Amino acid sequence: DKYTRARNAGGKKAQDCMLLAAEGDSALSLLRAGLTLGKSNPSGPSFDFCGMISLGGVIMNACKKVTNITTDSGETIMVRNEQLTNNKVLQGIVQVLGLDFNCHYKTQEERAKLRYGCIVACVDQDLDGCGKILGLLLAYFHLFWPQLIVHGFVKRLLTPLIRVYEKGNTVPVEFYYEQEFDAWAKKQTSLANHTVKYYKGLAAHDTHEVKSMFKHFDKMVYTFTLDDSAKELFHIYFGGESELRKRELCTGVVPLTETQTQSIHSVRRIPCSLHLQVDTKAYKLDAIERQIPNFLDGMTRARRKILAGGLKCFASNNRERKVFQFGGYVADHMFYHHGDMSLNTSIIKAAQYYPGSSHLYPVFIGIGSFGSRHLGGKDAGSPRYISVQLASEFIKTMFPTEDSWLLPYVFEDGQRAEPEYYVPVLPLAIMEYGANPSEGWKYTTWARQLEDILALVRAYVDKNNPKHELLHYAIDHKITVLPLRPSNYNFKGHLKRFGQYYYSYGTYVVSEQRNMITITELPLRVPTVAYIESIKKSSNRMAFIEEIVDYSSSETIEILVKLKPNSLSRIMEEFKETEEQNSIENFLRLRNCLHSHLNFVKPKGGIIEFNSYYEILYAWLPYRRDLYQKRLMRERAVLKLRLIMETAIVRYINESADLNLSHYEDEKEAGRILSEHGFPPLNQSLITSPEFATIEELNQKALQGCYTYILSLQARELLIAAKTRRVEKIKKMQARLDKVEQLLQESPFPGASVWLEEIDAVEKAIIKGRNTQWKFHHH
Amino acid sequence: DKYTRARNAGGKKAQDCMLLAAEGDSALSLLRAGLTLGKSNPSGPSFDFCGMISLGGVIMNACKKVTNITTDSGETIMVRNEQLTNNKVLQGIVQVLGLDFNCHYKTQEERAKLRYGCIVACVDQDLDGCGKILGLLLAYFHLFWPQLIVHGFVKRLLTPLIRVYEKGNTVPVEFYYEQEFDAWAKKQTSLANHTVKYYKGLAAHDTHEVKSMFKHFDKMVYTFTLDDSAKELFHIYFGGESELRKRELCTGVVPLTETQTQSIHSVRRIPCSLHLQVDTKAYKLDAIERQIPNFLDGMTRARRKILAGGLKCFASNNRERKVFQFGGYVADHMFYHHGDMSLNTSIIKAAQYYPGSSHLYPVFIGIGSFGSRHLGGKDAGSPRYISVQLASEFIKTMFPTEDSWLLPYVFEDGQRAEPEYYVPVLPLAIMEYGANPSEGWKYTTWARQLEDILALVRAYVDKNNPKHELLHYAIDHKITVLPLRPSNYNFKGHLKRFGQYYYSYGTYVVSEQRNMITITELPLRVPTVAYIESIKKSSNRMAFIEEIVDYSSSETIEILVKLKPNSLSRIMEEFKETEEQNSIENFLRLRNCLHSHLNFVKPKGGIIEFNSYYEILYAWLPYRRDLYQKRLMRERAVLKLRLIMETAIVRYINESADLNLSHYEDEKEAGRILSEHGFPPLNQSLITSPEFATIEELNQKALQGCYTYILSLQARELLIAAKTRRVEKIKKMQARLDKVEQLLQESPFPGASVWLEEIDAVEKAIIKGRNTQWKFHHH
DNA sequence: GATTGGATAGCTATTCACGG
DNA sequence: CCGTGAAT
DNA sequence: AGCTATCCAATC
Ligand SMILES: COc1cc(NS(C)(=O)=O)ccc1Nc1c2ccccc2nc2ccccc12
Ligand SMILES: COc1cc(NS(C)(=O)=O)ccc1Nc1c2ccccc2nc2ccccc12
Ligand SMILES: [Mg+2]
Ligand SMILES: [Mg+2]
Ligand SMILES: [Mg+2]
């Protein structure tokens, strides 16, 4: 309860006081600082007429918790959920404002009973603040007291996130959306004399800006208004039907026309339907993009940033670092503008490894406590006391280093960030476990057998496999010719397919001579403590058992169960036996069903729904093949340029004494003399280690050349051994060049043998990691 | 209430159950992993007879919170105050153990009533856990129930601190103290095949390691035993007399002899007196070292680390950074092995600036809110939302950049860290405000007037000042000839010296047409809120006042005292008007006394006590003088070496076409022919950038070198323009060399004029900072 | 009791889907 | 009712 | 994102 009352709140001047609701604590501090500006300006808000309160992060969604029931007289009353009534934030809001769940406030006399004139929401300009928190608050108010919105009881504090200043002019130009900002920027010829400022939340606007904004306080308050359509909109974005969200979120967001925003800014009334259509839709699309993995990479945006930052950090030396320090480094270098605790949790999850864990091939090696098979991995240590390091042996084979220069990249404010997506050697999307929800769709994936995947890919790329010709299709690409069965690496149970569903069964053994029943393997991905709690809550099963206990150490589980005398007969009697599941498995809940929700995010943004793992594999193959071809082409261009440069270098070295470079005056004279002598001008910085640059860029930049590759020659290279090593290197480049030229004309596509070798290397690395419990050089 | 009771604990097997008291959740996880072993370690501890509890706090010193009173029955009883009774950790411990404060437990019958047979402390091996926590626990038990310590009711878990593994062997060796490991390693012939591992606490250990520890569990439990001496020793370390700690902590810790440690490791019993004399004394000495400033530098260890880290970080660019990110950088790069919140608080305190603050000259510019005169500076923002940057001008003028290469340094694991101490141009120890306690001592300093300090230093250095001669002493250097008065920069009150004490007075005015009392200034360093609460607390003062009001701005003080009508008379009558302070000041408490406790830390460890600021200045002067001399000599030597190198380089570049280096085969042939031609062999890397080498190191490593400075020359240098620039550089270096030679011979000591120029520069920087409210290029 | 600095770490609730 | 990851 | 208590000393 962070309420800071107003002096006139609840008194005879209640109908002109204001209540400020802050998204978090930074907004609280900014509001307090602005309010405590008395005696410097008689005009402006102050604590005698304004309130102060905090919402505390995400607020609850009332539209799902409430349930509508009709009465005898046809009245429809909304019963509020037990959890809904016990929420502290909503209770505090309703107590401070003195709202009633029975009065409809249809008349001004009823509106006079509230303790404040109006409620003003102060939230950040980011997607989360404007779309989720404000949207949820609007949904709450619309659901319970729709009439309040009509009479302008709900207002918001609109603050820009972009400010462009021009030196010599004291007033800036403010943009509330990036679209209008960049449209204005591209409209102008040059902004080199200007300066742009972003505001990631209300943790900005230095005291000068705070004073300037609070001077014109009334110019920032915007009143929400209601229309007819908004009703059916509020049900779509916050109702209990996810099908409507699926249909709504399958398309993009249409921005507001100029007339609409002109009316909004001239009158300062915002229709809630427009707010839902723009801000909430944008937030939901961003949430989909953040919480659902890409079908090529298999990882979400946060995990991709983590991997890129880890590669950058541990490229120098693979030394352990604290999770907090590494997360801070990642947030600093990868431009992660969210809370650090979420990043640390994501790192910890990515580094975990145990039977049944989400990652079969984690990209990190964890030093410390990183969860266990029991407790579902939630028993991990704090990020301040555990360390992670790069599993370089597996990474350098799964994500080839030379292919990183060719992926499309994500640019923030003109700076490079983590790539848009990686293209692994083997399809990682269908090679690991995962399960989590998002807006509209849910994602769930059970890993496939490694041997089946290897056989399929080797058939596709081998050109010598007896099944290669039929894997390629001259009829259609829906037929299945090879099995893709669920993996059972760390699983001692069984997997059986019935109809269209795969079921996993744990294994047990029964010693009737003593009346003891012991289970030795639980089904796939079930925590032991959760399983024990589940088997204890069922009183029907609990009746037969005297006691159950465990002696599982850290990775192998066994439960021993002593049940009441002469209970087995009743066990078979009450619990039916079927070919899908026997009496004992039904009794002990040793059967699990593997449901798959193959919903991913396509490279160009958006969602995509698959029907089988074969579709994912067939979609992933062309990207990898094209990446191989592009890599080879750029490699050939680089070799040609490098050969030309090295031949010129050797030619200069041969006759360096004759030239007598010391005789000439300066750089330009020497360059002119060299050009007169026939030395070609190249781009040394673009050829010795080019860039993320592409091939046409390579040619264009190599067109304009300098003579720096001669002037930067150390005297040590002028000896004889250096020249001999240089010509040997030239021979090696020539051999590599004609080898890759031969590789280019290869069937079925260029670089098939390279793919085969990478497959073998990654298979060996995976085997080595499995042998040492995924702790390389630590066994 | 973290507590997992043992199965047998409660009164049936209470005599064999043991309770493990740990530090944090890391120890909890380690102990849980050890105890959960089953069917793989049958002879080992388990939850049948092992307790589990977390302290979850810090232990209060009970010896200071109790009162001993003798009743009429000739019995001395100890009554505990409210805070001791209400402490959560002690209450939990006494409830779990079921201790009685009336039973003396002198026999086995009363001891059997306890819920556990023994209590085992499981703390880290660092100074904190071993010293502070264990000493406080032992003090608690000895104060209340000595017989429990006598009968071995208290034990500790002794875990190895450092372990070295022999490659090819599965058994390492263990050391519990750093000195033992250091002695063994120095005595050991070679350790290339040996792998050392530090265990900072027990949060980091191998699974096989903990498996072995719980395989041999009783080998790591040591019982504490009492003796005759300890009865008084506790009173020295935890009693109410600080003089005993002053007399005890003024010397180093005497290590345990070989016979004592051999007996301890043989019988597994530890005398409590030895533990107090070693671990607690070491911890207290470390606390003194890290909580009291150095009299030369003027800052503590944490502040020195912060300053060095800021200098290293903001060198590339002065762009602002968030406080938490900068703290993470400092912790990473200078090996800060403590919590991040402490570092963030220290940085915030170092960057603060307001009237009456502790830092008249902050080493940081703070963007955001950093507190104000009211609330004493505790109203600053969160470290995640306020930015800091380096005050480049003041730092560069106060701590010269070159001198940083010549200070003694602190080494961690063979790597450099923050300097041992800094030697600023002006003595910063007596130009700031400070007040804080530490073990056995208190530090309190009131800043001196800048003008007096400048005059004193100049008279000591100018050699032309008419006061220079008698400032030096041919009779005795324990006399004062110049004033040293408290500074009044942001002070509009009065300062008056009476006897041996300075007093600060506020300023007040009176108006008789209402009898309005207006306070325009408070004494030095008193927050407004605390003063208001103090004036309200005393009944006899505000009983004559109805109201008090204050419209105080961010930097101004005004208090209006709405007091009773016709009241002045008994204010004069009651509150006595003395020559030291008038009745009105006595009635508003506007007089303060400036007490100074000048206790500092010597450069080579230890504490030192001064009697006046003149002593501090006199001690500080020779260090700066010697540093100036050493800097001048090192620069002279470096200049000579660089002149030789550049002359040789010029000669080569001049006659390079003659030798025709292309003819020779490899590096050795080129070196041989160069030596034959007479080019001297030097250490190019050292002379180009020594950065830490002493004056003798330059000479010793000059002759042993290579011919790298020739073979690393590029073609661009062979041109005429490069040679002309080189010869111009040679001329400039010669001019600087003979200028330095002139500076070397200079009365009274070398480099006096340099000191004068730097004094003028720092004075100008200070004035510029004062004029812009210590916000450079931000006004 | 209060007050100053530099050190000790672990809790506080939700949103989004779709099956148990 | 619970439970997953990524966010306030 | 914030919120939770104590140790040292000497004067108030
Ligand atoms: C409802 O969200 C919060 C409420 C409170 N206090 S209350 C009204 O329930 O008595 C405090 C914090 C939060 N929000 C939380 C977070 C917000 C931002 C970032 C991390 C957060 N982590 C939280 C963890 C547990 C509970 C609330 C958190
Ligand atoms: C659980 O919190 C604490 C645990 C300990 N454990 S131990 C054996 O090292 O003494 C010690 C102290 C705390 N409490 C802490 C705080 C309590 C109140 C207010 C602020 C606190 N700040 C802390 C900062 C770091 C560590 C513990 C703190
Ligand atoms: Mg935000
Ligand atoms: Mg510790
Ligand atoms: Mg910690």
Residue numbers in the entry:
A (entry chain B), B (entry chain A): 416 to 1194
Article passage:
The African swine fever virus (ASFV) type II topoisomerase (Topo II), pP1192R, is the only known Topo II expressed by mammalian viruses and is essential for ASFV replication in the host cytoplasm. In ASFV, a functional viral Topo II pP1192R has been identified, encoded by a viral gene conserved in ASFV strains, P1192R. pP1192R is detectable at an intermediate to late stage of ASFV infection, mainly within the cytoplasmic virus factory, and has been confirmed to be important for ASFV replication. Topo IIAs exhibit a 2-fold symmetry and comprise two functional domains: an ATPase domain and a DNA binding/cleavage domain. The mechanism of enzymatic action involves the opening and closing of three gate-like dimeric interfaces, which are called the N-, DNA- and C-gate, respectively, upon ATP binding and hydrolysis and DNA cleavage that introduces a double-strand break in the DNA (G-segment) trapped in the DNA-gate for transport of another DNA strand (T-segment).
To this end, the cryo-EM sample of DNA-bound pP1192R was prepared by adding both a DNA duplex, m-AMSA, and AMP-PNP. The high quality EM map allow us to build the atomic model of the pP1192R DNA-binding/cleavage domain in complex with both DNA duplex and m-AMSA. Secondary structural elements of the protein, all the DNA base pairs, two m-AMSA molecules, and ions (presumably Mg2+ as it presents in the buffer) were well resolved. The overall configuration of the complex resembles the drug-poisoned cleavage complex of eukaryotic and prokaryotic Topo IIAs, with the C-gate adopting a closed conformation. As presented in other Topo IIA-DNA complexes, the DNA duplex was trapped in the DNA-gate and symmetrically kinked by intercalation of a proline (P852) from each protomer into the DNA minor groove at two points. In one strand, the rupture of the phosphodiester bond was observed between –1 and +1 nucleotides, with the 5′-phosphate of the +1 adenine covalently attached to catalytic tyrosine (Y800) of the cleavage active site, confirming the formation of the cleavage complex, and a m-AMSA molecule was found wedged into the DNA base pair stacks (+1/+4 and –1/+5) flanking the cleaved scissile phosphate. However, there was coherent density in the EM map of the other DNA strand, with no phosphodiester bond break was found at the expected scissile phosphate, indicating a pre-cleavage state. Moreover, an extra density appeared bridging the phenolic hydroxyl group of the Y800 and the 5′ phosphate of +1 adenine, reminiscent of the position of the metal ion A2+ proposed in the intermediate state of the classical two-metal catalysis model. Since the DNA strand is intact at Site 2 and no m-AMSA orientation consistent with that in Site 2 was found at the site of DNA strand break, we propose that m-AMSA in the Site 2-like orientation may impede the function of pP1192R by preventing DNA cleavage and stabilizing a pre-cleavage enzyme–DNA complex.
